[PDB]
Design a protein around this motif. Structure first.
Motif, PDB file in Angstrom:
ATOM      1  N   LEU A 231     -27.429  27.285  -4.192  1.00 23.32           N
ATOM      2  CA  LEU A 231     -26.385  26.319  -3.876  1.00 23.32           C
ATOM      3  C   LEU A 231     -24.959  26.565  -4.386  1.00 23.32           C
ATOM      4  N   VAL A 232     -24.795  26.658  -5.697  1.00 22.77           N
ATOM      5  CA  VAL A 232     -23.475  26.882  -6.281  1.00 22.77           C
ATOM      6  C   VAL A 232     -23.416  28.290  -6.868  1.00 22.77           C
ATOM      7  N   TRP A 233     -22.531  29.116  -6.319  1.00 21.72           N
ATOM      8  CA  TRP A 233     -22.396  30.505  -6.753  1.00 21.72           C
ATOM      9  C   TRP A 233     -20.994  30.997  -6.393  1.00 21.72           C
ATOM     10  N   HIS A 234     -20.450  31.923  -7.182  1.00 24.96           N
ATOM     11  CA  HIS A 234     -19.109  32.446  -6.926  1.00 24.96           C
ATOM     12  C   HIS A 234     -19.069  33.578  -5.892  1.00 24.96           C
ATOM     13  N   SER A 235     -20.215  34.192  -5.603  1.00 24.45           N
ATOM     14  CA  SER A 235     -20.261  35.274  -4.621  1.00 24.45           C
ATOM     15  C   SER A 235     -20.672  34.712  -3.270  1.00 24.45           C
ATOM     16  N   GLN A 236     -20.419  35.473  -2.209  1.00 27.02           N
ATOM     17  CA  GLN A 236     -20.764  35.045  -0.859  1.00 27.02           C
ATOM     18  C   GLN A 236     -20.318  33.591  -0.631  1.00 27.02           C
ATOM     19  N   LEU A 237     -19.114  33.312  -1.125  1.00 28.87           N
ATOM     20  CA  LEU A 237     -18.477  32.005  -1.035  1.00 28.87           C
ATOM     21  C   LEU A 237     -17.302  32.120  -0.050  1.00 28.87           C
TER      22      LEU A 237
ATOM     23  N   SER B 196     -13.816  31.805   1.895  1.00 31.15           N
ATOM     24  CA  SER B 196     -12.476  31.699   1.337  1.00 31.15           C
ATOM     25  C   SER B 196     -11.910  30.277   1.415  1.00 31.15           C
ATOM     26  N   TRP B 197     -12.402  29.460   2.346  1.00 29.89           N
ATOM     27  CA  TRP B 197     -11.878  28.103   2.422  1.00 29.89           C
ATOM     28  C   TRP B 197     -12.263  27.328   1.163  1.00 29.89           C
ATOM     29  N   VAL B 198     -13.365  27.721   0.527  1.00 29.22           N
ATOM     30  CA  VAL B 198     -13.805  27.045  -0.692  1.00 29.22           C
ATOM     31  C   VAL B 198     -12.982  27.528  -1.891  1.00 29.22           C
ATOM     32  N   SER B 199     -12.902  28.846  -2.049  1.00 30.37           N
ATOM     33  CA  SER B 199     -12.180  29.455  -3.160  1.00 30.37           C
ATOM     34  C   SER B 199     -10.685  29.120  -3.252  1.00 30.37           C
ATOM     35  N   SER B 200     -10.078  28.681  -2.154  1.00 34.88           N
ATOM     36  CA  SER B 200      -8.654  28.361  -2.179  1.00 34.88           C
ATOM     37  C   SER B 200      -8.337  26.919  -2.565  1.00 34.88           C
ATOM     38  N   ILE B 201      -9.367  26.090  -2.704  1.00 40.07           N
ATOM     39  CA  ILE B 201      -9.162  24.697  -3.087  1.00 40.07           C
ATOM     40  C   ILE B 201      -8.837  24.638  -4.580  1.00 40.07           C
ATOM     41  N   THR B 202      -7.746  23.964  -4.931  1.00 35.01           N
ATOM     42  CA  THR B 202      -7.359  23.850  -6.333  1.00 35.01           C
ATOM     43  C   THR B 202      -7.400  22.398  -6.819  1.00 35.01           C
ATOM     44  N   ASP B 203      -7.825  21.490  -5.944  1.00 31.75           N
ATOM     45  CA  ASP B 203      -7.917  20.075  -6.295  1.00 31.75           C
ATOM     46  C   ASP B 203      -9.343  19.715  -6.728  1.00 31.75           C
ATOM     47  N   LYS B 204      -9.447  19.121  -7.912  1.00 31.08           N
ATOM     48  CA  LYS B 204     -10.726  18.725  -8.493  1.00 31.08           C
ATOM     49  C   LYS B 204     -11.578  17.814  -7.601  1.00 31.08           C
ATOM     50  N   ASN B 205     -10.991  16.718  -7.121  1.00 31.31           N
ATOM     51  CA  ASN B 205     -11.714  15.776  -6.262  1.00 31.31           C
ATOM     52  C   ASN B 205     -12.242  16.449  -5.012  1.00 31.31           C
TER      53      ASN B 205
ATOM     54  N   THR C 162     -15.295  30.789 -12.735  1.00 36.18           N
ATOM     55  CA  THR C 162     -15.329  30.767 -11.274  1.00 36.18           C
ATOM     56  C   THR C 162     -14.454  29.605 -10.804  1.00 36.18           C
ATOM     57  N   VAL C 163     -14.247  29.506  -9.495  1.00 33.64           N
ATOM     58  CA  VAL C 163     -13.436  28.425  -8.953  1.00 33.64           C
ATOM     59  C   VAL C 163     -13.987  27.058  -9.370  1.00 33.64           C
ATOM     60  N   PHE C 164     -15.310  26.932  -9.423  1.00 32.86           N
ATOM     61  CA  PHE C 164     -15.925  25.668  -9.810  1.00 32.86           C
ATOM     62  C   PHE C 164     -15.619  25.301 -11.256  1.00 32.86           C
ATOM     63  N   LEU C 165     -15.678  26.282 -12.153  1.00 32.39           N
ATOM     64  CA  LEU C 165     -15.383  26.009 -13.556  1.00 32.39           C
ATOM     65  C   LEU C 165     -13.886  25.753 -13.740  1.00 32.39           C
ATOM     66  N   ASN C 166     -13.071  26.573 -13.083  1.00 27.25           N
ATOM     67  CA  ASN C 166     -11.621  26.457 -13.187  1.00 27.25           C
ATOM     68  C   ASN C 166     -11.038  25.167 -12.634  1.00 27.25           C
ATOM     69  N   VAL C 167     -11.558  24.717 -11.501  1.00 34.76           N
ATOM     70  CA  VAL C 167     -11.042  23.512 -10.874  1.00 34.76           C
ATOM     71  C   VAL C 167     -11.732  22.229 -11.331  1.00 34.76           C
ATOM     72  N   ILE C 168     -13.059  22.247 -11.387  1.00 36.92           N
ATOM     73  CA  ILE C 168     -13.808  21.067 -11.801  1.00 36.92           C
ATOM     74  C   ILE C 168     -13.989  20.966 -13.317  1.00 36.92           C
ATOM     75  N   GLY C 169     -14.182  22.105 -13.972  1.00 34.09           N
ATOM     76  CA  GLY C 169     -14.394  22.093 -15.410  1.00 34.09           C
ATOM     77  C   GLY C 169     -15.884  22.215 -15.691  1.00 34.09           C
ATOM     78  N   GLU C 170     -16.265  22.239 -16.964  1.00 35.80           N
ATOM     79  CA  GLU C 170     -17.671  22.373 -17.349  1.00 35.80           C
ATOM     80  C   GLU C 170     -18.626  21.383 -16.693  1.00 35.80           C
ATOM     81  N   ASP C 171     -18.108  20.217 -16.322  1.00 32.73           N
ATOM     82  CA  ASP C 171     -18.922  19.180 -15.701  1.00 32.73           C
ATOM     83  C   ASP C 171     -19.524  19.570 -14.358  1.00 32.73           C
ATOM     84  N   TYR C 172     -19.065  20.673 -13.780  1.00 32.15           N
ATOM     85  CA  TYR C 172     -19.581  21.072 -12.482  1.00 32.15           C
ATOM     86  C   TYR C 172     -21.090  21.310 -12.514  1.00 32.15           C
ATOM     87  N   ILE C 173     -21.596  21.812 -13.633  1.00 33.98           N
ATOM     88  CA  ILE C 173     -23.023  22.063 -13.744  1.00 33.98           C
ATOM     89  C   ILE C 173     -23.821  20.751 -13.773  1.00 33.98           C
TER      90      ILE C 173
END
Length: 302
Positions: free
Chosen positions: A85-91, A93-102, A142-153
């Motif tokens: 489900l959540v992984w930095h590879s095979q992601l 580009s529309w996902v990786s370019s989002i910089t908004d947490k919400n 990864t984008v998830f950690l950078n944008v959402i923070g540790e809470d992403y897990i």
């Protein structure tokens, strides 16, 4: 297929399954289908359930490949591990370019919920979060950690649990093959912390992509991973450079020695189709015949 099924034999030893990675392109060519039907009891989609394949465009899902595997598996009595489900590879580009947490949080939750609900009750376990750790034990940026923070897990697991309560939720990673390794120690510590906080993590998946001779370390590493307290642990993407029986048998024994180790998944059927084909790391050769390691495992399970 080999006459003897390592899946049946490991089941006789009290484990849940001995499986393999596969997908439509493999099932429809060569002897993959037959080998999987006769010798294994579980399948993991090699690529069909990854983000780039399932949601190439936001909200425009593609389940063609994933449906083929799930239906084939049900019909043939094989368990399924959802990956991933959540992984930095095979992601995409529309996902990786989002910089908004919400925005990213909702996109992540929607991706998780949509995939899991479509196969609700048919998937034994899901690799919810994949390769979230750096080699020094810190969390991969990864984008998830950078944008959402540790809470992403925690969010990913809480969401997965709600989507399909019946599925075993896993955090999966590689290089957890040695007990002294920084990463191995880190994941055990973080998973304990997360579980103490109420995060629903049912299992730790150790990919176990090994080099020749590394099998011995797994005998110590697996009991360590099991000490984190998760209901299960599993060898999820096993392959060994050289496919020496010694390494393969060691990994199997490590699992038999750990009560919570539910099973083993080898990453592919025949060597030429391996993501590291040049190291001929699998159990069946280029001509689809079982290799010495397959026989060594059968004998060990006897």
């Amino acid at each position: 297929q080999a006459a003897q099924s390592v899946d049946q034999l490991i089941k006789a030893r009290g484990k849940v399954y001995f499986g393999v990675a596969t997908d439509q392109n493999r099932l429809t060519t060569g002897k993959n289908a037959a080998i999987i039907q006769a010798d294994f009891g579980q399948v993991t989609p090699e690529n069909s359930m990854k983000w780039d394949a399932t949601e190439p465009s936001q909200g425009n899902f593609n389940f063609a490949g994933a449906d083929y595997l799930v239906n084939w598996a049900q019909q043939n009595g094989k368990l399924i591990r959802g990956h991933t489900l959540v992984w930095h590879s095979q992601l995409p580009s529309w996902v990786s370019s989002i910089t908004d947490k919400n925005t990213l949080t909702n996109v992540m939750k929607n991706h998780i919920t949509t995939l899991m609900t479509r196969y609700k009750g048919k998937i034994r376990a899901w690799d919810v979060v994949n390769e979230a750790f750096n080699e020094d034990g810190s969390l991969r940026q990864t984008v998830f950690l950078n944008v959402i923070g540790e809470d992403y897990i925690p969010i990913a697991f809480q969401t997965a649990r709600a989507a399909d309560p019946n599925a075993k939720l896993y955090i999966n990673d590689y290089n957890l093959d040695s007990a002294s390794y920084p990463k191995t120690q880190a994941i055990v510590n973080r998973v304990k912390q997360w579980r103490a906080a109420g995060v629903p993590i049912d299992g730790i998946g150790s990919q176990t992509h090994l080099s020749a001779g590394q099998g011995a370390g797994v005998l110590q590493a697996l009991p360590l991973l099991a000490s984190a307290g998760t209901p299960e642990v599993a060898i999820t993407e096993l392959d060994v450079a050289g496919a020496s029986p010694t390494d393969y048998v060691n990994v199997v024994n490590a699992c038999l020695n750990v009560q919570s180790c539910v099973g083993i998944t080898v990453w592919g059927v025949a060597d030429p189709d391996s993501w590291r084909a040049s190291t001929t790391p699998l159990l069946f050769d280029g001509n689809f015949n079982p290799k010495p390691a397959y026989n060594a495992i059968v004998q060990d399970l006897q």
